Amino acid sequence: LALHKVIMVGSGGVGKSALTLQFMYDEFVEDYEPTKADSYRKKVVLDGEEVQIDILDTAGQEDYAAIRDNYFRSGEGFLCVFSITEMESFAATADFREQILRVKEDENVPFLLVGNKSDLEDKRQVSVEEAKNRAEQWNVNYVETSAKTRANVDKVFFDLMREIRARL
Ligand SMILES: Nc1nc2c(ncn2[C@@H]2O[C@H](COP(=O)(O)OP(=O)(O)O)[C@@H](O)[C@H]2O)c(=O)[nH]1
Ligand SMILES: *S(=O)(=O)c1ccc(S(=O)(=O)Nc2cccnc2OC)cc1
Ligand SMILES: [Ca+2]
């Protein structure tokens, strides 16, 4: 089977693990250890083709740059997650983007900008407009998700796999 290697990136508390666990297990998990990284593998039917998705849920604990870069080098596509409720997490996406580009050396690396916590509109700190503008600058798609309500959860994983399939 095709194996699509997805890496979740983004600053702390944005929803990397909640998104991964909603996709994997159909549960909203609210207390997942912030420092725990893990890999997940699932067979999924992508546009009618059985494939395997592998998701590396990074937890930010790899501080040694060569090792972090090694993890990114193995990835084929990236979900770059921020929380719509934390402007600083949106700002931080630029750093993950630069890290990925240094390693992959390809501006067209499969990559979605993911604004999570869309069910907290009343706490929004990052406008849809500014996130769409950043996505346009980077030539990536912007999708807003909620790990709580499941909104666009399958979409971000499937659309990222579609980019991996098309581009690699
Ligand atoms: N309301 C809401 N809370 C979320 C969402 N995603 C994550 N959370 C909460 O935000 C906290 C951090 O999520 P987590 O996935 O552990 O963040 P990570 O550090 O990026 O892995 C947890 O308490 C989650 O329940 C979401 O879409 N909506
Ligand atoms: S490795 O398999 O021993 C390993 C070590 C650390 C992690 S992490 O906590 O998810 N940290 C990161 C992983 C990949 C890229 N950046 C990270 O933190 C900045 C995972 C696997
Ligand atoms: Ca996590």
CB-CB neighbours of 93 under 10 Å: 24
> Does domain 1-168 fall into CATH 3.40.50.10330?
no
Which helix (H) or strand (E) covers residue 6, if one does? Answer: strand 3-9
Distance CA 96, CA 23 (A): 22
- For residue 117, the one-letter residue type is K
* Residue 13: C-alpha distances to residues 39, 83, 166 (Å): 18, 8, 31
Determine contact, residues 113/141, Cβ cutoff 8 Å: yes
Determine contact, residues 56/6, Cβ cutoff 8 Å: yes
This structure was determined by: X-ray
Task: Return the structure tokens found at 77.
Answer: 């596509």
**Domain spans, the chain:** 1-168
In this structure, which residue's CA is closest to atom 16 in ligand 2? 68
Long-range contacts: 39-45, Cβ < 8 Å, 24+? 43/1, 44/158, 44/161
68 lines ligand 2 (CB under 6 A): yes
- For residue 146, the one-letter residue type is S
Determine contact, residues 74/89, Cβ cutoff 8 Å: no
The DSSP output letter for 26 is S
- The preferred substitution site among 8, 16, 30, 116 for testing ligand 1, maximizing ligand atoms within 8 Å of CB, is 30
Task: Return the structure tokens found at 47.
Answer: 């546009």
